[PDB]
Amino acid sequence: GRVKLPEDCPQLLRVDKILVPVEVIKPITLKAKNLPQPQSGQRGYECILNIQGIEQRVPALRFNSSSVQCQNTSYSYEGMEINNLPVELTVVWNGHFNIDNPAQNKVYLY
Amino acid sequence: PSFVTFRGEPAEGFNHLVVDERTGHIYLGAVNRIYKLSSDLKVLVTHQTGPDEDNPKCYPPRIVQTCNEPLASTNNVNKMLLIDYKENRLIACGSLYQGICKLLRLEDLFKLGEPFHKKEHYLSGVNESGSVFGVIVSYSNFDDKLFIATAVDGKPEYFPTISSRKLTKNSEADGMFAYVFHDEFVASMIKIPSDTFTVIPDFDIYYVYGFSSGNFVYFLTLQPEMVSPPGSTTKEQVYTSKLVRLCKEDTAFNSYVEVPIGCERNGVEYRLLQAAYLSKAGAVLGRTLGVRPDDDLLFTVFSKGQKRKMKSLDESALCIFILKQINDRIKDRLQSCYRGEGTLDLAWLKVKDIPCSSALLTIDDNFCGLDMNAPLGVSEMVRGIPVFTEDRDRMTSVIAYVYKNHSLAFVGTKSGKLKKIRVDGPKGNALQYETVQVVDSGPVLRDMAFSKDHEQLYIMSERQLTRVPVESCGQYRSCGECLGSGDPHCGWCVLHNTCTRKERCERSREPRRFASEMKQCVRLTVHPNNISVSQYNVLLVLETY
């Protein structure tokens, strides 16, 4: 569990842009590094999308120290105002613990 | 004196217990909890496996996919527990996940991994504790695996009752619980056929005990009414207790064998296995038994009749099987099939009876099984040698060990008592003592293990674990009394003037230092036996032998 070096820290690595169509059931695979294995008394991972219209909480599975995936779900925003809406996403585990997002990767709902 | 114990730390529940050979630390499986305890039964660490929102009906549990059925916080029962020394961890398989298994680190109980994603990662819907068993066998790398049997609950498509699975080094690895050899045609697993389910609705295999011997793996199982008892249509279910075996080496699963097992006492039938324990005889039992030092033995416990596996009868009997004898029965059976005589006769597996094919073969104990005359059953039920029978209070569990060549047997009771039995068919006698370390009102569980040092015997109850010492000879004050009691553990440590076991007496090995029989005591005589009150300071001579 100890982190002496900055390279080793828990963070989400970027992949080709995450495209998400509205009203489509799709999984969102993620890559990352040094994801912790939840210890006793600690719950699993969730994907939180910060959409002003609706914030979605989808639970996810941590396959290994470097990969995650939100489960099949569909997303939407109300308005039909703009085609491409980038959304900040926060990966959390054990409820509150937010994993660091240096790149600040976002999900594009189109 | 009081016995050291661990109360249900969760006062709430308890299910399985195991001891680490090196450390002596005791790991205890329970509902919603897995505990690590010291030899003394002090609480080392508590793990929360428990209450998870879930539903038994749902296939791939909520995490993988959405389930229409409503969820409720439910209890996760520890179905199984197995120590993986090589991996330096503990496999603690639960339920309520569709039976997902967990890996806890040996020292701290840190969760190394718990594979949920694939179908193999799910063992069984079954909520019941102890209905599952298995063995972990390991070798150096590029040689290895886990054999596990579990009940299906009528899930035949989802899970295999018996399987040969993979245990990768990395707990994170996806590969875990994958079948050793998977082929489109045949996989290292045995499923229950759908046809058999339709015929008998409820059929299910419950695995009580399991152990590795030589180079095989045996399981004591309970099954349903299939040609026993005869019945045209479904109605009542009665069970038949049988022995199962596999070659460790058979990826194909061709080696499967299944013999019904039981024993009878004066015209009374004891068909249902409560528990079993593989062990050694030691010089005493082995000699009269006619065995080699290495040869194994299997102590077992059976209830009377075929009825009510859920709640069996009080009448119970402790029987015995010599592995050589069972091996013979199996070899005898195989050499017969190879004769081409009769059918395979395994009702649940093969509905339509296929015939045995004759062939030229050298039939040995090594025989792993062949493509033709494939998995087969057995006609002649193997009878066991009876030892002790309790009518009033049902035996629940058993263990045994070698002490100074004498074979001591331990038997749990429905009452919460342990019996210390010297088996003396090969010698000559019966039950030496009974103890209530445990729990005066209500019973003991099959997981009953002796410590590594073999000083104590941890006895598990639904509520508590109790460290019952294997002898309490100290109660006896004199050589006459000590040897008088007869409980075989006790001897008179002459110089110490105390009553205890051979191990306890320092220098007992030396001559006349320790007394086994009353004759050895002590005999004393005084020459002036009678002396008058008037006399004083008279010389007396003492003769002692």
Numbering used by the authors:
A (entry chain A): 692 to 801
B (entry chain A): 37 to 581
Paper text:
Class A plexins (PlxnAs) act as semaphorin receptors and control diverse aspects of nervous system development and plasticity, ranging from axon guidance and neuron migration to synaptic organization.
In five out of 13 full extracellular structures all ten domains are resolved whereas in the other eight structures some of the C-terminal domains were not modeled due to fragmentary or absent electron density. Some flexibility in the stalk is evident on comparison of the 13 different structures and contributes to the ring diameter ranging from 84 Å to 99 Å. This out-of-the-ring orientation of IPT6 is observed in all five PlxnA ectodomain structures for which the electron density is sufficiently well ordered to allow IPT6 to be resolved. All our PlxnA full ectodomain crystal structures have an intermolecular plexin–plexin interface in common. This interface is formed by blades 1–3 of the sema domain of one plexin molecule and the outer side of domains 4-5 (PSI2-IPT2) from the ring of a second plexin.
